[PDB]
Every structure is written in C-alpha cells, then in structure tokens.
Design a protein around this ligand. Structure first.
Ligand SMILES: [Mg+2]
Lengths: 100, 469, 100, 50
DNA sequence: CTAATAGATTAGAGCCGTCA
C-alpha cells in the first residue's frame, strides 16, 4: 500500500492531473493515474478497483466543476470510503480544489 | 413367468389448486391451504432448555440446506414456506427448577417416578392454562436426556400409581387429554445436537447432512399442531369411507382385556378432507383373541355410520374396513346387522409378515415403487417401499418388503383397493416425507390406541389428532 | 435480450457471483442499457450470502440500494414485490400454473 | 421545496421515526424518510443530496 | 381343565442407519 491514487475527470482536467502526476513522480512517490498507467486491452474497472483496494495509501481527488457529479469519480470515492473505513485512517481521502 | 402391474402416483393438493407429487416441493412452490397469522408458543422447561429452544427458533428463520438438493429438498425458511410468523419473541416461559427434577427421578420405582414427573409438568401446564391471560397455541415441553434414559418400561436403575403406563410420553399425553392442550415434546439433544457428544468428541446423533430434513419435519409438525392445513388428497371419490381398526393389550391388571380403536377418513363434500379418530375403546375380555363381540361390533359400526351421516347428510355408498387381522363370521354378521341395505361393506386385511423379495438382475438399485403382483382376484402384493425416480433414491436401504393385501370379506376390485391403499400413504401429518410405507388409517389408529391405554380414567376422549400425535 | 427485451435487471449478489466473468459482462451490458434509457432504477442487487460483507462488493454496484435476503427470504420477496409495484413493472394476472 | 426531511440513526430509531413520519403525513405534511421513501436500486447518496 | 407334537396368526419391546 504505497501508491498514491489520483481521481479526476477525463479529459477535462488532464493538464493539471498530468502536471501533478509528473511532479509527484519527480519528488519520489509512486503514482497511479488514469491517463499514464492504465493498460491497453485490460479490464479497467476491475483493475481500478483492485488498485484502490489492495495498493493505495492516499486518495488524492481533483475537485472542479467537471469532476463534481461524475460516475467514475463517485464510484472511486465510494470504494475509497470503504477502504478508509476498513483502514481506520481519517485522512485517507484528500480533495484538491483547482477550479475558481 | 409371472406378470407385474404398475400403479401411478396419486398426487396431493396445495394452495391455488396446484397439484404435486411431493409435499416439500409443493410447500416451497405454492404454500398451504389455510391462512394462519402466527404461532404463539408456550415453553415449559429449564433455563438451558429455554435458551436451546430460542436458538433453534432463531435458526429456522433462514434457509437451511442438506448435503444433496436432489435427494432432499432444502428448507427456505419458516415464513417463506408457511406464510406465518413463528419467532422467539411470542414465547411465555414456565420455569422448572432442576432440583425438583433431580429429586423425583430417584425413587427406585419406574412407575412412581414417572407419575411424579408427569404430575410435575402437567401441574404447571394446567395452572398456566386455567388462570392466566396469555394465549398459547402449542406447548413445547423440553425434556433432559437423563429423564429420557430411565423412564422406559424396560429401564433398570444402575400400587396407587401402578395403574398407569411406565412411559413418560404416553402417560403425559393421556393425563392432559381432558384439558385439550396441544403439546409437542422435544428432547434437549434434538434441538441442540452439536453440543451432546460421546466419549470421542463427536455428536451422538449427527444431523450435519440432514438439517433441512429435520427443519421440514419440525416445522410441519408445529404448523399442523397449531391448526394449520398443510395439504390434502386430490383424487378422493365421493361416497367412500375408510375405516381402520387396531387392537392393543390393556394389561396392567388381572385381565389383558384387549382393546380396539378406530380411525375414519372421508370427503368433506366441500372438497375438504375429514380425517379423525373414531374411538371409544371397545373391549374383549378373552385373552389372545382379536375379534369383537357382536354388541361391540354393532356399536362401533353404528357410531361410524352415524358420524358419517351427520357430517355428510347421507349414509355412505361404500365402507372399506382396513385391518391387520382377519374377520370371523360372528364379527361380520354383527357388522352386517346394522349396515344399511344400499351400502357395500368390504373388509380388507393388510399383512406385512409374508416373505417375498424381488431383485433386479443388474443394478444396485431396488425395484420400482408402485409395482404390484396379483396372485388372485382376492389377493395381491403391493410395493409401497421402493425406488422413487423423482428423488433419485429409494425409501429404504436393503431390499424392501411388500404388503400382502387380501380382500377378506365382501366383494370388491383388488386393483382399486391397491390404488386406494397407495393413495392413503400420502397423509402422514406427523412427518414431512415423500410417502409412507403403510396407510395412515392403520397408523394413527395405532397411535390413538397406544395413547389411551396408559390410563384408566379417560372418558369420552377428544377425536382431533392434534391431542394425541 | 438484455438490450431489447429486459425491463428490470435483477442481480443475485453472493460470494460466488462476485468477480465472475459472465456476471460482470452482463452487468456492463446492463449499465450501457441503463444509460441508453431514462431509468436510474434499472439494476437491482439482491444480497443473500452472509459471508459477503457489504464492504466487499464489486465497484459496479457499491453505490446501489440493494434488497436484503440474509435474515429471511419472505420479507425479501415482499420487498421485491413492493419495489416492482412502485416502479410499475409490467405484469399479467397472477397464475401459479405457469411456474408449475 | 415543500418536503420535511427526517434524519436519524438506523435501525435504532426506526420506531419513533416511523411514528413521527406517519403522524406528520396524516396531519398533511409531506415527509421524506429513507425508511418509507428510499427506492430500491437507486444511487441513494445522490438521491439524498438531491 | 390339563402336558407334549406341528402349522398358522397375532402383539410387545429394543437396537441400528440416514454422508458418500
Ligand atoms: Mg409429532
């Protein structure tokens, strides 16, 4: 459990998400992203759920007018809430406000 | 070469006018006939017995499975099946201290300690019935294993009360007859079997693979004893009455003084099913003889005919007297001196002590169930136990024995007699099985006779089966 | 039949149906059909396995309101019937002969 | 925007909540409660927020 | 009434198995 997951809306918030992922990789952390590490031809919902449930220490959410009320983001938030309850960490989910 | 005949399955009826050959399947698919609202139960026993009963009630609100779903249908829960509530919240407790139980089971005399224990339990039951406000449908009597071990007639211990049977169950059921309280007796090792073990760490009785069967049986018995109708026969013809006669030995005195009891079944005419005991026990003083004197035979047949007439409004067109013995000429002459002119009286003997076994030449599975061999126009063998293709197994374990049916008196057709005898095997309300091996007219009469032979004070006993079974 | 005939998608959720390929593919098709129509209550889970904790559900139905069957099946059947009556699911006159 | 919303613990307070909701409905007030008005098979958090 | 030899018919108790 040492992967920082980043949840965002594709492709409306790709610039900030890619910037943040590259910065966090440069600083030394391990980052899993929808646009940089998902494989081609793989069952993606199952892989995403596996990543959230088995190897994830932080859940950094990108919050904006686009990522609000999105089905993929909401499902990831629900699974991350289940993981937070199972992990007894009150700071598992962290929103990042980027939209004015 | 001898020729065999086949008899088709009779089928039973369920809710919404739907027919099925199995009771478990028809109950899981359709449901019972009438509409109960909920079972309010009274529990008399020790504290641990009460906890065991509560745990069992909590256990059968959910699905319970067997090892094989084809050989044994599963249990989908009490409320799913019977559409009524039987839960461990509508329970009234009548505590029985363990010190009294220990005290009374030591008198070194089976009769006296049995009488004391039956008095102990029925005193509380009667007092609760007479002077309380709670309403109880069935009374569940939880009995420890130490009571069950030493209260058998042939039990060894490692005058006033001698005019009773030395059996706890029969004396208990007979001494509660004049109050008409439906009751169900449970051992403590039956509801919680996982806890009682022998000196190896394993249960004495292993229900691991047959839990659903036990749940079916217990639920059906509790539902029937609370006034529920689980099912009924679907092809009973009009104007036919079935009468079963059974003999017992009264004993427990100078005179063996044989006694006779009857069971009656016919059609309600409202498309129901009337099935009740016809018993005021009739006596024969001579030892070893199982025939009625003319007066007793006249009284028995007159009472049965009058009961049928009062229920229906007309005399029967056909009376079959099933029995395990033969009839003599005095018996049948007495029978015929009260029968109406336009009524046919046929007396049939069903015997089990007749050696004959058919073996299939190739397989390790026994003969098909509904096979029959007709010796003569007045005799035939009938296989009521055998392989049932529906459940992919047989009703026995070794090679089964057939019943020898003989038209002893009257003039009938043996094929129709065999058909009726096979149909009667589908009414064992004291169990939840695919089919019985004996007609229920000869089994419930036996139960009634063995119940009202454990006491001498019984007068005009009730006829509903829920007060004996 | 999922795309052109189905009106309600009842799913049986248990320790066996969780992470099963055919079930997951049928769920994906049902989700596409639910998006295709204007019906948010198109998929109904029914939980029956006591060993399947409510926090161990697959990501496809973590956010759905299910019908409980574990404690008893009669009340689950009543809940299904009430839901169908409230959502106006098509039906004919009651007849037990078809099931027979 | 004319519905009374009742928030409560579950299942510990269903008896009082059901009593109050039924009384309020009988008196003529529109009430929303997950006990009696949460549809089966819906995204319930989004519905509650809505 | 009564003591044996059969055949033929009756009831009573009590124990063991149910998976595979
Ligand atoms: Mg019984």
């Amino acid at each position: 459990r040492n992967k920082i997951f980043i949840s965002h809306a594709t492709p409306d918030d790709n610039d900030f998400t890619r910037w943040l992922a590259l910065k966090l990789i440069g600083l030394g952390y391990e980052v899993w992203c929808d646009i940089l590490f998902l494989d081609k031809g793989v069952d993606f919902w199952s892989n995403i759920e596996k990543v959230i449930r088995e190897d994830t220490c932080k859940f950094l959410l990108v919050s904006s007018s686009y990522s609000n009320q999105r089905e993929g983001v909401l499902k990831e938030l629900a699974v991350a809430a289940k993981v937070k309850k199972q992990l007894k960490d009150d700071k598992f989910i962290i929103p990042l406000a980027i939209d004015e | 070469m001898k020729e065999l005949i086949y008899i088709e399955e009779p089928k039973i009826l369920f809710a919404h006018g739907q027919k099925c050959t199995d009771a478990r399947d028809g109950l899981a698919l359709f449901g019972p006939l009438n509409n109960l609202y909920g079972i309010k139960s009274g529990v008399i026993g020790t504290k641990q017995g009460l906890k065991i009963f509560r745990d069992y009630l909590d256990h059968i609100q959910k699905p319970i499975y067997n090892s094989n779903s084809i050989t044994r249908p599963m249990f989908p829960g009490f409320e799913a099946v019977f559409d009524c509530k039987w839960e461990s919240t509508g329970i009234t407790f009548k505590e029985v201290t363990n010190e009294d139980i220990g005290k009374f089971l030591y008198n070194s005399s089976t009769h006296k300690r049995t009488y004391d224990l039956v008095s102990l339990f029925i005193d509380k039951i009667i007092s609760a019935n007479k002077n309380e406000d709670e309403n109880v449908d069935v009374w569940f009597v939880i009995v420890p294993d130490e009571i069950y071990k030493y209260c058998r007639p042939n039990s060894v211990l490692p005058a006033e009360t001698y005019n009773y049977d030395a059996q706890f169950h029969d004396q208990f059921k007979a001494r509660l007859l004049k109050h008409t309280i439906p009751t169900q007796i449970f051992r403590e090792s039956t509801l919680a079997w996982r806890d009682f073990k022998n000196a190896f760490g394993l249960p004495i009785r292993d229900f691991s693979k047959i839990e659903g069967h036990l749940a079916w049986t217990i639920s059906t018995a509790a539902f029937y004893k609370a006034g529920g109708k689980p099912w009924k026969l679907s092809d009973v013809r009009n104007g036919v009455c079935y009468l079963g006669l059974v003999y017992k030995k009264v004993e427990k005195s100078k005179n063996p003084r044989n006694a006779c009891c009857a069971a009656q079944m016919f059609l309600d005419n409202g498309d129901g099913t009337v099935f009740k005991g016809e018993v005021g026990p009739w006596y024969n003083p001579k030892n070893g003889q199982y025939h009625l004197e003319p007066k007793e035979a006249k009284a028995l047949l007159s009472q049965s005919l009058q009961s049928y007439k009062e229920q229906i409004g007309e005399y029967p067109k056909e009376v079959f007297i099933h029995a395990k013995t033969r009839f003599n000429h005095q018996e049948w002459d007495a029978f015929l001196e009260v029968t109406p002119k336009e009524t046919n009286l046929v007396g049939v003997t069903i015997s089990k002590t007749k050696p004959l076994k058919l073996y299939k030449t190739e397989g390790d599975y026994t003969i098909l169930r509904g096979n029959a061999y007709v010796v003569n126009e007045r005799s035939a063998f009938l296989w009521t136990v055998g392989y049932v293709p529906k459940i992919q197994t047989a009703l026995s374990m070794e090679v089964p024995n057939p019943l020898f049916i003989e038209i002893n008196k009257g003039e009938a057709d043996i094929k129709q007699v065999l058909k009726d005898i096979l149909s009667l095997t589908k009414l064992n309300y004291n169990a939840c099985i695919f089919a019985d091996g004996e007609p229920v007219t000869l089994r419930f009469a036996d139960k009634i006779g063995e119940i009202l032979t454990a006491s001498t004070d019984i007068k005009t006993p009730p006829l509903a089966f829920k007060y004996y079974i | 039949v999922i795309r052109e005939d189905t009106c309600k998608f009842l799913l049986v959720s248990s320790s066996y149906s969780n992470q099963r390929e055919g079930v997951l593919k049928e769920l994906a098709v049902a989700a596409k059909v639910k998006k295709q129509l204007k019906d948010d209550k198109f998929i109904i889970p029914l939980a029956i396995d006591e060993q399947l904790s409510y926090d161990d559900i697959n990501i496809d139905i973590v956010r759905l309101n299910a019908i409980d069957f574990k404690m008893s099946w009669a009340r689950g059947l009543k809940d299904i019937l009430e839901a169908f009556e409230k959502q106006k699911v098509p039906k004919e006159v009651a007849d037990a002969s078809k099931s027979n």
